[PDB]
Each structure stands twice: as C-alpha cells, then as structure tokens.
Amino acid sequence: HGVQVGQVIDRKLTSKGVTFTVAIEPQHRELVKGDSKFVVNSRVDVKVGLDGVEFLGASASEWINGGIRILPGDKGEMKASYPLYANLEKALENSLSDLPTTT
Amino acid sequence: TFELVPGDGEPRKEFVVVPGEKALLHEPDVLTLTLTAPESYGIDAGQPLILHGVQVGQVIDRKLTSKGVTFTVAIEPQHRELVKGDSKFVVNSRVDVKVGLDG
C-alpha cells in the first residue's frame, strides 16, 4: 500500500528458476493475512493510444525503489512457498504462464 | 547544534528536546490534521503541503493500518486561517498523462 513493510533478504538461482527469500517486519506481519499475491514492482508497463493511456507495473517512485508489491487477502494457512507473478493482471488471473489456458 | 526559540510565560528550568522534524509539530500554534487514504500515493513523512504554489505545511508522519494509510500533517500558524476548515486535499505526487489526436 505504498509503504515499505519488508526486504528481500537473499536471492538464489537453481535449475527450476530463481528463489527469493524475503522478510516482513513484525509491525506489518498481521496485514499479510496469509493470502497475499506478490507482483514484480521493479518493471514498468506503458501503453499509449488515442484515448487509452496506461502506466502500470510501477510508478516513478516505485521504479526507483524496486522490489515486490504485496496484495493482502482475508485468510490463509501461511504456506511455505509462493509464486511470483509478472504483473497485476496475471496475479488476479492466477496464471503462471504468459499465455492463458485454452478453453 | 541546539537552537533556542524563545517564548512567553512562567520561567522554567526543564525542557524536552524535539528534533527538527517535530519542531513544526511542537510549535505553540499549529494546525494538526489527519487524512486517511486507500494508498500512500508515494507520500513520505517529509513531503511539504503546498497551497496556491506556496508551502504552508508539512507531513509530520505516515502510518499504515488495516483500513489504509493515515497521514498526520501540520500547518503553520501563519497560513492556518487560509485553510478555512473546508479544504480538499489532492495528491500532488502522482502525474496523469493522456494523449490523443488533439487532446
């Protein structure tokens, strides 16, 4: 919510991919609620058209800060591992792959 | 370096030292206000409040709760009367860009 609540302690590279170990301060630990969606807040998406202008991903301050944005939910069991979504659209759609599922 | 700001009243021999951040807050006359928002909008605890292009106040502190983000701000006694009690607060930190054929 625009306020720093944690810090990426370390990053590791394995065969599967990239694993980030992060820490959240005890002051804002309850605000996570255990059903959080993590979005890459280090990249910026720009779309321009005749009337539609979208500046998503991160703002200017969010870009100069970098890191991982957190979207809290309501209830969860505090699972060990969480996926890192590319953007808010994929985080909402719960789609890990870039292409959507064929229906 | 300590700074002395004289006042009036009964002489006293004990004082409580506040930092320069709280110097405006601890003034004898100051308009203290609280504003709630769903997001911080990239506003820290040092951003200055601007009225008609002239700085009149300062965001003393920012807090994050379950409801949202609460900013506690201070307004100098010189411009306290200009608020008039029916003020509308706008985020002066974000920028909106729209481009079209003529607009």
Side-chain angles (χ1 to χ4, degrees):
Chain A
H1 285 171
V3 182
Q4 174 184 355
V5 302
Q7 182 181 355
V8 182
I9 299 300
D10 51 289
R11 170 190 63 180
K12 194 179 183 300
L13 178 66
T14 56
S15 60
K16 294 93 59 181
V18 187
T19 57
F20 299 90
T21 300
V22 305
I24 300 299
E25 303 177 358
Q27 306 175 7
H28 317 277
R29 183 178 181 179
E30 192 181 3
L31 303 181
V32 185
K33 295 299 181 179
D35 198 3
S36 54
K37 303 300 182 61
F38 292 88
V39 186
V40 175
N41 200 68
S42 302
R43 298 184 176 183
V44 285
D45 181 70
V46 181
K47 296 181 179 180
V48 284
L50 295 186
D51 188 74
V53 181
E54 299 181 0
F55 185 74
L56 303 178
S59 194
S61 59
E62 310 294 331
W63 178 85
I64 69 179
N65 288 16
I68 308 174
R69 189 164 173 259
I70 302 180
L71 303 179
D74 68 317
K75 189 179 181 61
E77 297 183 1
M78 195 67 70
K79 47 183 175 300
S81 180
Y82 298 87
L84 178 64
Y85 302 93
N87 48 32
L88 282 78
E89 295 84 17
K90 292 174 185 176
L92 292 180
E93 292 178 358
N94 290 20
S95 180
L96 303 182
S97 185
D98 303 332
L99 62 148
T101 61
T102 297
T103 68
Chain B
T1 292
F2 292 97
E3 184 71 22
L4 178 60
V5 185
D8 70 320
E10 181 179 2
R12 54 188 299 187
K13 301 299 180 299
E14 300 179 2
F15 296 94
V16 180
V17 176
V18 293
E21 303 175 0
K22 311 302 178 181
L24 179 60
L25 180 64
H26 284 69
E27 290 188 358
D29 295 330
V30 55
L31 180 60
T32 58
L33 294 181
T34 304
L35 49 117
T36 62
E39 201 179 3
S40 179
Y41 297 106
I43 300 179
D44 208 4
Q47 306 292 338
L49 282 81
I50 300 179
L51 167 60
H52 285 171
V54 182
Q55 174 184 354
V56 302
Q58 182 180 355
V59 181
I60 299 300
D61 51 289
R62 170 189 62 179
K63 194 179 183 300
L64 178 67
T65 56
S66 60
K67 294 93 59 181
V69 187
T70 57
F71 299 90
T72 300
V73 305
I75 300 299
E76 303 177 358
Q78 306 175 7
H79 317 277
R80 183 178 181 179
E81 192 181 3
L82 303 181
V83 185
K84 295 299 181 179
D86 198 3
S87 54
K88 303 300 182 61
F89 292 88
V90 186
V91 175
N92 203 70
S93 304
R94 288 189 174 182
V95 285
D96 181 70
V97 181
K98 296 181 179 180
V99 284
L101 295 186
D102 188 74

